[PDB]
């Protein structure tokens, strides 16, 4: 659902990040919070950002004046796993 009112503010909100670079794609339901300087080229990077060496995370920059396509949306993903265990979650 749209949350432009709650998440964006004047001059843009920079508290929300996303990872732009990673050595490999994520496995399903994986979380990578490492901030290693991503090596995009043949240069070593030596732990400092620079030529072909970028910070892995990036700021969304939610301006209130942004188009619908660039407005902050909040997402909730419900996963219903059924294993060989007692089913402990049910409804009416």
């Amino acid at each position: 659902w749209n949350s432009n009112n709650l998440d964006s503010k004047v001059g843009g909100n920079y508290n929300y990040l996303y990872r732009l670079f990673r050595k490999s794609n994520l496995k399903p339901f994986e979380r990578d919070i490492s901030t290693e300087i991503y090596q995009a080229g043949s240069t070593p990077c030596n732990g400092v950002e620079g030529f072909n060496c970028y910070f892995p995370l990036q700021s969304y920059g939610f301006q209130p004046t942004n188009g619908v396509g660039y407005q902050p949306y909040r997402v909730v993903v419900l996963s219903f796993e059924l294993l060989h265990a007692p089913a402990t979650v049910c409804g009416p």
Partner: antibody, heavy 121, light 110 residues
Framework: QVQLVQSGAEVKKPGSSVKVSCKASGGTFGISWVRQAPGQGLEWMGRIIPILGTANHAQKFQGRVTITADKSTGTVYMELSSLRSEDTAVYYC?????????????????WGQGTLVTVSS | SALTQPPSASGSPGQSVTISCTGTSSDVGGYNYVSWYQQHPGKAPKLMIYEVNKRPSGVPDRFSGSKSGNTASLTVSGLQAEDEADYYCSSYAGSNNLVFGGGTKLTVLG
């Protein structure tokens, strides 16, 4: 339609500050600045990737170069302060990669026209 | 300064000229980000070679880049009068450092 248009033909007294603009047209990943003294060779100054926020300086220009960009206008500014007679040169923009391909080739594809900054008393 | 490029290479039409660009292990020898620019007097530089051997879209096949140890080399094969210009080499000197050469004034003799 991938041209870089450089503004300005400014003259500045020694010790003042100059700000040169580059307007990018078409897709441009990062814009670098290269200066050339009259008669002398090329020397690198700095690089900016507006989509990422990183900026670079050559060691010799530490404390003197400020490279900014405004995405609303699509332009990139480079400010050199504490000018002296050594700085009188032509300042060029340079494209570093197309709008995609977050790679940097360190070869500058398209160059703007000259921006001559004459520093004199 | 910082690179050794011979100021004054010359050649003849049809022949081939090899312009050298000598660095050290830490700039030219170690990494593969080397560029050759051609600049006609009064005009802006134009990219001829990037990443050692890569010709960009619109550069004739005459210009061929190469590298050996600490020396990059640009070879002009199909020399014409138009090639009379200043040729600079640039290389990666480390994170946040790019180094240019002194420039070579290529003179076509014929």
């Amino acid at each position: 339609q991938v041209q870089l248009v450089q503004s300005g033909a400014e003259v500045k007294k020694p010790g003042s500050s100059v700000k040169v603009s580059c307007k990018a047209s078409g897709g441009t990943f990062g814009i670098s600045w290269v200066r050339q003294a009259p008669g002398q060779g090329l020397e690198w100054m700095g690089r900016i990737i507006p989509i990422l926020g990183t900026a670079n300086h050559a060691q010799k220009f530490q404390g003197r170069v400020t490279i900014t960009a405004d995405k609303s206008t699509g332009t990139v500014y480079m400010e050199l302060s504490s000018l002296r007679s050594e700085d009188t040169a032509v300042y060029y923009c340079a494209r570093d990669g197309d709008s995609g391909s977050y790679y940097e080739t360190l070869g500058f594809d398209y160059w703007g026209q000259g921006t001559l900054v004459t520093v004199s008393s | 300064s910082a690179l050794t490029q011979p100021p004054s290479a010359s050649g003849s039409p049809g022949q081939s000229v090899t312009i050298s660009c000598t660095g050290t292990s830490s700039d030219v020898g170690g990494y593969n980000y080397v560029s050759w620019y051609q600049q006609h007097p009064g005009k802006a530089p134009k990219l001829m070679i990037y990443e050692v051997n890569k010709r960009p879209s619109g550069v004739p096949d005459r210009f061929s880049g190469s590298k050996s140890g600490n020396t990059a080399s640009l070879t002009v094969s199909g020399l014409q009068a138009e090639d009379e210009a200043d040729y600079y080499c640039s290389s990666y000197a480390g994170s946040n450092n790019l180094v240019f050469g002194g420039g070579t004034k290529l003179t076509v003799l014929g």
